[PDB]
Design a protein around this nucleic acid. Structure first.
Lengths: 214, 225
RNA sequence: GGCCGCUCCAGAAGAGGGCCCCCUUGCCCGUUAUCGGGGGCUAGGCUCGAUGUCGGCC
């Protein structure tokens, strides 16, 4: 029975000057053997808090931790721009040491609908036996968006993958790319290729589509 | 003044071996406990092994016991992680980290300094350059007076690929998405750009795709219907 | 039966021990190492002991 650390929320949005609280629950008691780490993309973690509430040297005083039972809390009293990052809790009550899944703190900004764009597979790719149909969702916020692929009005499943950029450094939005991948044989079977996007910034879903050939 | 520098990460097939190194400066290994913690792509953090160089003591996560070996050399102020019988699920960024020894604390506390990490990829996949296909700007997929076009960088291995547009002259409004690992073991990714629709006749848009592991360089021009 | 003993057998047998909770290690302690006290639970599973329903000798 490893001790499990469960962090919530998975992510949260906030603005400079806000007070931010992240929580982490241990599957059983760990007394006060908890630490908190900050990690930014493609960078190493940095220790913030140890023994659940002790400030590590060089950690600014806006960082603080506390404990209530098996619940542990990381508080940033006044979020500064360099604090947007992922935060992990960790117990070292008992080996193996274990980590929470991490909480991402993202920049708050106003809702923005995505510009949707659909791309049929190139003729070049079709002769090599595969069809990739790409749907672009450009410059939107918040992160949560759903792309539904429809072929001759048939809801697709399991034949698409998604990739999302980090928050843009200038305007803090996201952009997402979904690729629908088909055997050329299955591609020739059907005519209408549709991408249906739903998002908080769209009052009704936006469908972009084409017909094979026409 | 403290630095941890990891080396020895790389590409290798299942059943193979790698030896990581963690060069430490600014402190003495005998005054610390040293750890390896791994981060799989997109995932969190998971502990691998720990060593106290002063005493020789070591410990392991149950999923590497008997395959990995942690060791330290105080004459080089460095720690190591020998990794045998690698499986795909060992693919991750491997960080080493120090816990400082405090003769009043009666036990080892947090991981207070982490290195930059070294990448370990375990895959059967063959090194291969990408195929670049145009994502054609549409006559019926305009947004405003704004058009989106791009190029799909497909079926390459391993990471990474670099993409620029018009040899770097065009950077504004470019999104190059994170690669996705397909079930075949190859990576694919698209890079896109938004552009004035009125510029679709006069401006030429070319994506410059470079893949160092395969010495593969492609310049693909993207054009309307 | 007497004497001796616990290697085998029993669980009929105590103590260590174990798990959980509180106390930021809090009498004294602490392997480059996670305790101590308080509380709740735990018996035949390990060590050590005891015993017979055991064994050895005469």
């Amino acid at each position: 029975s490893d001790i499990q650390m469960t962090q919530s929320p998975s992510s949260l949005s906030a603005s400079v000057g806000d007070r931010v609280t992240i929580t982490c629950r241990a599957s059983q008691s760990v007394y006060y053997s908890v630490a908190w780490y900050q990690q930014k993309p493609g960078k190493a973690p940095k220790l913030l808090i140890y023994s659940a509430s002790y400030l590590y040297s060089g950690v600014p005083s806006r960082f603080s931790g506390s404990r209530s039972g098996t619940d542990f809390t990381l508080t940033i009293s006044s979020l500064q721009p360099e604090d947007f990052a992922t935060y992990y809790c960790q117990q070292y009550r008992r080996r193996p040491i274990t980590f929470g899944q991490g909480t991402k703190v993202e920049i708050k900004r106003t809702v923005a609908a995505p510009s949707v764009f659909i791309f049929p597979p190139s003729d070049e790719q079709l002769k090599s036996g595969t069809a990739s149909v790409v749907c672009l969702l450009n410059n939107f916020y918040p992160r949560e968006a759903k792309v539904q692929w429809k072929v001759d009005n048939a809801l697709q499943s399991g034949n698409s993958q998604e990739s999302v950029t980090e928050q843009d450094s200038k305007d803090s939005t996201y952009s997402l790319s979904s690729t629908l991948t088909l055997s050329k044989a299955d591609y020739e079977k059907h005519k209408v290729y549709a991408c249906e996007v739903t998002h908080q910034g769209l009052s009704s879903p936006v469908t972009k589509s084409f017909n094979r050939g026409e | 003044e403290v630095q941890l520098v990891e080396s020895g990460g790389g590409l290798v097939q299942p059943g193979g071996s790698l030896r990581l190194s963690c060069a430490a400066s600014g402190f003495s290994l005998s005054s610390s406990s040293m750890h390896w913690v791994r981060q799989a792509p997109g995932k969190g953090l998971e502990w691998v092994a720990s060593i106290s160089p002063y005493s020789g003591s070591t410990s392991y996560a149950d999923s590497v016991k008997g395959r990995f070996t942690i060791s330290a050399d105080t004459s080089k102020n460095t720690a190591y992680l020998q990794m045998n019988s690698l499986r795909a699920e060992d693919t991750a960024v491997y960080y080493c980290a120090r816990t400082k020894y405090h003769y009043k604390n009666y036990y080892w506390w947090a991981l207070d300094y982490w290195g930059q990490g070294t990448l370990v990829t375990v895959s059967s996949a063959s090194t291969k350059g990408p195929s670049v296909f145009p994502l054609a700007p549409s006559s019926k997929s305009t947004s405003g007076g704004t058009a989106a076009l791009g190029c799909l960088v497909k079926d390459y291995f391993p990471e990474p690929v670099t993409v620029s547009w018009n040899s770097g002259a065009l950077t504004s409004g470019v999104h190059t998405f994170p690669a996705v690992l397909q079930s075949s073991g190859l990576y694919s990714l698209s890079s896109v750009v938004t552009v004035p629709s009125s510029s679709l006749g006069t401006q030429t848009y070319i994506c410059n795709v470079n893949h160092k592991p395969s010495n593969t360089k492609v310049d693909k021009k993207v054009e309307p219907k």
